[PDB]
Design an enzyme around this catalytic site. Structure first.
Site, mmCIF file in Angstrom:
data_model
loop_
_atom_site.group_PDB
_atom_site.id
_atom_site.type_symbol
_atom_site.label_atom_id
_atom_site.label_comp_id
_atom_site.label_asym_id
_atom_site.label_seq_id
_atom_site.Cartn_x
_atom_site.Cartn_y
_atom_site.Cartn_z
ATOM 1 N N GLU A 128 38.041 27.697 37.985
ATOM 2 C CA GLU A 128 36.985 28.559 37.418
ATOM 3 C C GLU A 128 36.565 27.980 36.102
ATOM 4 O O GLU A 128 37.417 27.802 35.203
ATOM 5 C CB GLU A 128 37.472 30.013 37.349
ATOM 6 C CG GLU A 128 36.495 30.942 36.600
ATOM 7 C CD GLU A 128 36.882 32.403 36.648
ATOM 8 O OE1 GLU A 128 37.786 32.771 37.407
ATOM 9 O OE2 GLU A 128 36.280 33.197 35.894
ATOM 10 N N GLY A 188 35.643 41.702 39.152
ATOM 11 C CA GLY A 188 36.373 42.145 37.968
ATOM 12 C C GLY A 188 37.472 43.068 38.455
ATOM 13 O O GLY A 188 37.297 43.870 39.411
ATOM 14 N N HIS A 228 29.582 35.972 38.607
ATOM 15 C CA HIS A 228 30.506 34.843 38.830
ATOM 16 C C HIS A 228 30.171 34.288 40.229
ATOM 17 O O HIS A 228 30.243 35.004 41.184
ATOM 18 C CB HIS A 228 31.929 35.372 38.878
ATOM 19 C CG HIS A 228 32.415 36.003 37.580
ATOM 20 N ND1 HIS A 228 33.739 36.194 37.331
ATOM 21 C CD2 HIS A 228 31.710 36.596 36.473
ATOM 22 C CE1 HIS A 228 33.922 36.817 36.102
ATOM 23 N NE2 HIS A 228 32.681 37.078 35.572
ATOM 24 N N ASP A 236 29.314 34.637 32.700
ATOM 25 C CA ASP A 236 29.486 36.041 32.182
ATOM 26 C C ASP A 236 29.966 35.948 30.713
ATOM 27 O O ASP A 236 31.079 35.609 30.481
ATOM 28 C CB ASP A 236 30.421 36.779 33.119
ATOM 29 C CG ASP A 236 31.020 38.055 32.554
ATOM 30 O OD1 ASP A 236 30.731 38.501 31.423
ATOM 31 O OD2 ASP A 236 31.807 38.629 33.295
ATOM 32 N N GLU A 274 48.043 45.141 33.966
ATOM 33 C CA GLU A 274 48.026 44.000 34.881
ATOM 34 C C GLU A 274 48.197 42.733 34.070
ATOM 35 O O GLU A 274 47.310 42.293 33.373
ATOM 36 C CB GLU A 274 46.659 43.962 35.693
ATOM 37 C CG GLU A 274 46.397 45.269 36.470
ATOM 38 C CD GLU A 274 47.383 45.566 37.600
ATOM 39 O OE1 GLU A 274 48.589 45.154 37.539
ATOM 40 O OE2 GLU A 274 46.984 46.289 38.563
ATOM 41 N N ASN A 295 53.265 38.966 39.129
ATOM 42 C CA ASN A 295 53.720 38.188 40.305
ATOM 43 C C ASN A 295 54.610 37.082 39.779
ATOM 44 O O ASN A 295 54.994 37.085 38.607
ATOM 45 C CB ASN A 295 52.509 37.636 41.173
ATOM 46 C CG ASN A 295 51.635 36.592 40.390
ATOM 47 O OD1 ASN A 295 52.088 36.007 39.408
ATOM 48 N ND2 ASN A 295 50.327 36.445 40.787
ATOM 49 N N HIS A 301 55.507 41.536 42.489
ATOM 50 C CA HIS A 301 55.073 41.305 43.848
ATOM 51 C C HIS A 301 54.902 39.872 44.143
ATOM 52 O O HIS A 301 54.418 39.130 43.340
ATOM 53 C CB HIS A 301 53.774 42.073 44.204
ATOM 54 C CG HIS A 301 52.564 41.736 43.271
ATOM 55 N ND1 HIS A 301 51.698 40.715 43.510
ATOM 56 C CD2 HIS A 301 52.159 42.297 42.043
ATOM 57 C CE1 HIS A 301 50.808 40.628 42.492
ATOM 58 N NE2 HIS A 301 51.093 41.570 41.595
ATOM 59 N N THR A 302 55.428 39.432 45.279
ATOM 60 C CA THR A 302 55.268 38.030 45.608
ATOM 61 C C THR A 302 55.110 37.906 47.122
ATOM 62 O O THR A 302 54.937 38.929 47.865
ATOM 63 C CB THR A 302 56.440 37.199 45.038
ATOM 64 O OG1 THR A 302 56.038 35.843 45.138
ATOM 65 C CG2 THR A 302 57.751 37.422 45.953
ATOM 66 N N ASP A 360 45.580 42.889 42.745
ATOM 67 C CA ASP A 360 45.151 44.197 42.162
ATOM 68 C C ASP A 360 45.320 45.343 43.094
ATOM 69 O O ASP A 360 45.818 46.416 42.644
ATOM 70 C CB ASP A 360 43.668 44.096 41.669
ATOM 71 C CG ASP A 360 43.556 43.051 40.565
ATOM 72 O OD1 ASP A 360 44.099 43.288 39.459
ATOM 73 O OD2 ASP A 360 43.071 41.934 40.845
#
EC number: 2.7.1.-
Length: 467
Positions: A96, A120, A184, A211, A279, A305, A352-353, A451
Site C-alpha cells: 500500500e 476503513g 483507496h 486519502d 484494534e 494477531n 486470533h490467528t 476486524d
C-alpha cells in the site's frame, strides 16, 4: 477415559451450535456501539493483462521496470504507480503506497473500478454491527460526500450532526456533506497472474492510497466538541486506525497531536463506564507503538494477531519470544499475552490467528468462549459469501468443518494448561479461552476478516455477559 479425536469433533460441533444460538439471543441486548476513527471508500479493480501491459508501454516500460527494482517511499508519478503494481505481482506481496500526486489521482479515477465498497476498519464494522447484527451504531466518518454516505447499508447506523448546539444522530445518507472522497484503489490479481514476463507466486493486491484524512487521523468537529454527548448514547466502543501515526511529520507536528485527543476520549468513555476495545494493527514506528502500549491501561480490551502481538513483544518482550509468536507457537503466544496483561493491567486480550483464537480475561465464564465461537462463524460466513447481509447467513458457516489440526492442538495445550471445560482454562487471577476455527477452503473474500473476528467476539461477549 480420554475423549477421542472423533469425540472432540462432535463436541465442538455442539458447542458451535449453542454459541451461535446464545450470540443471537444476546446481541439484541447491546444498546449502542461507537466506531472510530477510520472510514473511507475502497475502489476495487480486478487487473486485466492486456490493459495493464498497454498502460505500462504508454508511460514507458523502461521507467516502470526500474521502479520494481528500486521502489520509492510513495507514489509521485504514473510510472511509480504501475511499478508498484508489477512489484506487488512479482513478489506476490500485499503493498500500500500513498499517492501524493494530483495528476496520478486523476489518472486513477479515469482508470476506474469494477466495484465500490465501504472501506476503513470503522466503516466496515458499521456495515457488520449495524447492518447485519442490527446493533445501533455510531460511526466516525472523517469526510462524508454522497459517494461515501451511500456505501453504508440500511439499518441502525448513525452519524452525529450538530443542530446549533444540540447533537442529533441520523443515518449517513441523511448527512451528505460537501466533503472529499477518500478513496483507496485496490488492484487485485489471482494465483499466477501474468503480465509481460512477470508472474504472481500467489494472489494478492496492491493499494494506491489517495486519502489525506485518515492518514493523519483528522477527526470530525462533532467528535472533537461533542464526544461526551456521543458517549451517552453507547455501551461499547471499538477504536481503530491509529496504526498510521508517525513520530514526526514534515510540518513539525507529531503523533501526540492525535494521541492526546484519543486519550481524552478514553477518559470520557471510562467516566461513563463504556467498555472499549482497541484494534492494535501493526504500527511501523516503534516510538508510536510504545505510546499505544502505554495507552492500553485505559482500554477494557485489545484485539491482535500473530504479527501484531510479535511486534509488541519487540518493544516490551524480547526478540526470541517475538519470533516464536510470529510463527503462532501457542505456548509462546500465551506467554506473550500474559506479559502484555502484566505490563498494562488490561482486562481482556483477544488473539486470533490461522487455526485458533485465544482470549485472556481477568474475569471468568463460558461467555468468553461462546463469543469466540460466534466470531469464528462470522469470519467463515464472510469468507464464504464475500460480504454478509443478514445474521441468518452466519448459520450456514456451521456447515464449514472445524479445523481438525486445531482440535488436536487443544490436547497439546491442555497437557500444560489443564482445562476445567472444553476451551476453558483457569489461571490464578485470569481465565484463558481457546477455540479451533473454521477455515473456508475456497474463500470469495480475503479482506475485512481480522476486524470481523475481533469486533464480533467483543460485542457478542458483552451482550452475553450483560446483567
Amino acid at each position: 477415559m480420554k475423549e477421542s479425536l472423533k469425540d472432540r469433533i462432535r463436541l465442538w460441533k455442539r458447542l458451535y451450535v449453542n454459541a451461535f444460538e446464545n450470540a443471537l439471543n444476546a446481541i439484541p441486548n447491546v444498546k449502542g456501539v461507537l466506531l472510530a476513527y477510520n472510514t473511507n471508500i475502497d475502489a476495487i479493480k480486478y487487473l486485466d493483462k492486456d490493459d495493464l501491459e498497454k498502460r505500462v508501454t504508454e508511460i514507458g516500460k523502461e521507467k516502470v521496470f526500474e521502479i520494481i527494482e528500486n521502489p520509492p517511499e510513495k507514489i509521485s508519478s504514473i510510472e511509480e504507480l504501475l511499478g508498484g503494481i508489477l512489484r506487488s505481482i512479482k513478489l506476490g506481496k500485499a503493498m500500500e503506497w500513498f499517492v501524493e500526486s494530483e495528476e496520478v489521482r486523476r489518472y486513477l479515477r479515469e482508470w476506474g473500478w469494477d466495484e465500490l465498497r465501504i472501506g476503513g476498519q470503522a466503516g466496515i464494522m458499521a456495515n457488520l454491527l449495524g447492518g447485519v447484527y442490527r446493533i445501533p451504531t455510531i460511526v466516525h466518518v472523517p469526510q462524508n460526500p454522497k459517494l461515501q454516505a451511500e456505501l453504508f447499508v440500511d439499518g441502525p447506523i448513525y452519524v452525529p450532526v450538530f443542530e446549533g448546539n444540540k447533537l442529533k444522530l441520523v443515518h449517513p445518507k441523511d448527512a451528505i456533506a460537501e466533503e472529499e472522497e477518500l478513496i483507496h484503489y485496490i488492484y487485485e490479481f489471482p494465483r499466477g497472474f501474468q503480465v509481460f514476463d512477470v508472474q504472481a507466486p500467489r494472489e494478492n493486491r496492491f493499494i494506491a492510497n489517495a486519502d489525506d484524512y485518515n492518514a493523519r487521523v483528522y477527526m470530525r468537529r462533532e467528535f472533537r466538541e461533542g464526544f461526551e454527548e456521543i458517549t451517552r448514547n453507547v455501551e461499547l466502543a471499538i477504536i481503530s486506525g491509529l496504526q498510521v501515526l508517525k513520530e514526526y511529520y514534515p510540518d513539525g507536528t507529531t503523533y501526540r497531536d492525535v494521541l492526546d485527543r484519543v486519550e481524552s476520549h478514553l477518559n470520557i468513555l471510562n467516566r461513563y463506564n463504556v467498555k472499549s476495545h482497541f484494534e492494535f494493527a501493526y504500527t511501523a514506528n516503534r516510538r508510536v507503538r510504545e505510546a499505544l502500549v502505554e495507552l492500553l491501561p485505559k482500554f477494557t480490551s485489545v484485539g491482535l494477531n500473530e504479527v501484531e502481538l510479535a511486534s509488541i513483544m519487540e518493544i516490551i518482550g524480547d526478540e526470541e519470544l517475538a519470533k516464536e509468536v510470529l510463527e503462532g507457537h501457542i505456548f509462546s503466544v500465551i506467554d506473550a499475552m500474559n506479559v502484555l496483561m502484566d505490563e498494562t493491567g488490561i482486562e481482556r486480550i483477544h488473539f486470533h490467528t490461522y487455526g485458533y483464537y485465544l482470549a485472556l480475561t481477568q474475569y471468568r465464564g463460558e461467555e468468553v468462549r461462546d463469543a469466540l465461537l460466534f466470531a469464528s462463524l462470522a469470519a467463515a460466513a464472510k469468507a464464504m459469501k464475500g460480504n454478509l447481509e443478514r445474521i441468518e447467513q452466519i448459520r450456514d458457516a456451521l456447515s464449514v468443518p472445524t479445523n481438525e489440526r486445531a482440535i488436536v492442538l487443544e490436547e497439546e495445550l491442555e497437557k500444560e494448561f489443564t482445562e476445567f471445560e472444553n476451551g476453558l482454562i483457569d489461571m490464578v487471577d485470569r481465565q484463558l479461552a481457546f477455540v479451533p476455527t473454521k477455515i473456508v477452503a475456497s474463500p470469495k473474500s480475503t479482506v475485512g476478516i481480522g476486524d470481523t473476528i475481533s469486533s464480533s467476539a467483543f460485542v457478542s461477549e458483552f451482550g452475553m455477559r450483560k446483567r
